[PDB]
């Protein structure tokens, strides 16, 4: 169903998650809160921000890439770095 | 009356406008689409993105600061720079 799914927890980390999705235009992408994440329907899973990174392993067995800093700003810079922007 | 109002045009410049809002916790803040902007109820006006920056002068006669780059990423970095992050 999706090529890239980017998960976050909360309206702050949503920003960073959204910017990670700005790095991809090669397929269908889903940006969604961890509380709405449905496992098993994505090729790639990216988890953004500390909150989502602590909860994700209890929600899915899929492999994933973590994008996380110490605060909302650091996370945002790491997101930008991850997509080479 | 709002201490800070941040205006944007569209869901992409919304993201940078949200980031500018992360820089302010000293007062009441409105983040809103340029279509919904109501002049005369803010101490500080900040206009995010090329879209809003072209429409705003025909909507209000208030002074404002422009936060805009050539693409969405440039706009986002300028948002971060505007709040010293």
Author numbering:
A (entry chain F), B (entry chain A): 186 to 270
Sentences from the paper on this structure:
Endolysins are produced by many double stranded DNA bacteriophages to effect the release of new virions from an infected cell by degrading the bacterial cell wall. Here, we present the crystal structures of autoproteolytic fragments of the CD27L and CTP1L endolysins, covering the C-terminal domain.
When crystallization trials for full length CD27L endolysin were set up, crystals appeared overnight from freshly purified protein. The structure was used as a model to solve the structure of the full-length CD27L crystals by molecular replacement. It was found that the “full length” construct had been proteolyzed and the crystal contained six copies of the C-terminal portion of CD27L alone. The refined structure shows clear electron density for all six monomers of the C-terminal domain with a Matthews coefficient of 2.3, and there is no space in the crystal lattice for an additional N-terminal domain. The C-terminal portion of CD27L consists of a platform of four parallel beta strands, flanked by an alpha helix with two additional alpha helices mounted on top. The autolytic fragment of the C-terminal domain starts at the end of the linker at methionine M186, which is still integrated in the C-terminal domain. All six molecules are engaged in one common dimerization mode, where the alpha helices α1 and α3 from one molecule stack on their symmetry mate from a second molecule. The dimerization is such that the N-termini of both monomers are pointing away from the dimer interface, and we term this dimerization mode a ‘head-on’ dimer. An alternative dimerization mode is found among the six C-terminal domains present in the crystal structure of the proteolytic fragment of CD27L endolysin, between two molecules that are each involved in separate head-on dimers as well.
